[PDB]
Amino acid sequence: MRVALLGGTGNLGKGLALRLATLGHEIVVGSRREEKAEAKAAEYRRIAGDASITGMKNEDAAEACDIAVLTIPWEHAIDTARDLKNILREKIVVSPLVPVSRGAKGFTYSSERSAAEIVAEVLESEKVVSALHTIPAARFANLDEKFDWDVPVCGDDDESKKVVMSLISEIDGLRPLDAGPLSNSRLVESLTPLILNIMRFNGMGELGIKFL
Amino acid sequence: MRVALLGGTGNLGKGLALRLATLGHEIVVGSRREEKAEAKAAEYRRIAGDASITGMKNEDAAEACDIAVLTIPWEHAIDTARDLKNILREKIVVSPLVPVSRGAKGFTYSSERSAAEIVAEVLESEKVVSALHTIPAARFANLDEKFDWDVPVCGDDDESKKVVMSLISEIDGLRPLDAGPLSNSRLVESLTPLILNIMRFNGMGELGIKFL
Numbered sequence A, B: 001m002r003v004a005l006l007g008g009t010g011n012l013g014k015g016l017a018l019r020l021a022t023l024g025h026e027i028v029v030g031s032r033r034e035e036k037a038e039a040k041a042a043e044y045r046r047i048a049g050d051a052s053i054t055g056m057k058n059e060d061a062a063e064a065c066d067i068a069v070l071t072i073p074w075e076h077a078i079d080t081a082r083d084l085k086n087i088l089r090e091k092i093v094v095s096p097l098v099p100v101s102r103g104a105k106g107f108t109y110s111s112e113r114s115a116a117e118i119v120a121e122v123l124e125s126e127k128v129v130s131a132l133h134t135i136p137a138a139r140f141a142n143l144d145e146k147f148d149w150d151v152p153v154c155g156d157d158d159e160s161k162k163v164v165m166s167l168i169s170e171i172d173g174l175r176p177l178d179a180g181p182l183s184n185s186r187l188v189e190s191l192t193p194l195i196l197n198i199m200r201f202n203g204m205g206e207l208g209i210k211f212l
């Protein structure tokens, strides 16, 4: 399938582009500036080798995709979603977004509503799927690294959720787990500030989570 | 050291009594009636063998302990803490409590403030340590059970937190991880409803968590 990584110029986008393209999916890296996206797409192809990774302006990436992943920072996510609303409203949109703040006492969940539900409202969409929030980006973007992580997935539409879970299952090392309706997204998103706190107070590097 | 398991007649209390007693700690199983606590302790002693597991009224167990673990359901936990306030405010109190609501769309975190912070407020104590919320009770009570679980620990008093972390570290199969001040307890307590959702929507048995 075709997967657009909106703002996919960071490590999560890089990891998804490299791993999914190697599996045969057509990846489109999106960025505010087309030149930036094409440049990063070129970079990923060199690492990945002979695979389909192309770069486009976010609007064109969204237009061309089946699934759009919002790899943009939370701080600019609502504005980006709003601008792409008409295009994204009919696509499956995956939100790995988390409202988290750093503070003197550690990391906190900084919203009264979840990022995924806010995005669903801004998009007026029934196809938003919350997933991929707890994937250690640097480790994920390193193709020599092996891992065993679980990926909780939330969403109101059974079909969209099933498609996204199937896609995640194709990546060796990731196990998707259904966490229910989008109303449970706050519980999934909260794992990020919890993990950042564990990293901070125990002097540990990036971590994923496993339920067993 | 001495550990009081208040309302420790359930599986979490069972698992803790057996494992800590076998490690050489003096365990006091607490209950409303002295005679019923005594019977539960006897049942545990027969499983554990030559170990120190004694039964007492909750009030007496708390008074005799160094650490008191609130192994009671959330429903009447605050009333229980309040009743034992004068005794507990001077001891290290461990809270594995989680405010959870069960509805049509899954499980949700049902409090604005965390259970641990509410307990500290009622007790007017700085020695509350939040820990052990994500230990599958029935599995933990079975000594032949294989598991590798991490246990996030929150608390404002470093000495008290260190004591509790050292205690948990002694139990094979558990690894305590510092999650910061008590203000991060909501993030830790939130793992329970998340796991209950994962269990419900994937048809899984009780699970613990591991960071890796």
Ligand SMILES: [Mg+2]
Residues within 6 Å of the ligand: none
């Ligand atoms: Mg040993």
Ligand code: NA
Residues within 6 Å of the ligand: A168, A169, A170, A171, A172, A173, A174, A175
């Ligand atoms: Na997989």
Ligand code: NA
Residues within 6 Å of the ligand: B168, B169, B170, B171, B172, B173, B174, B175
């Ligand atoms: Na241990």
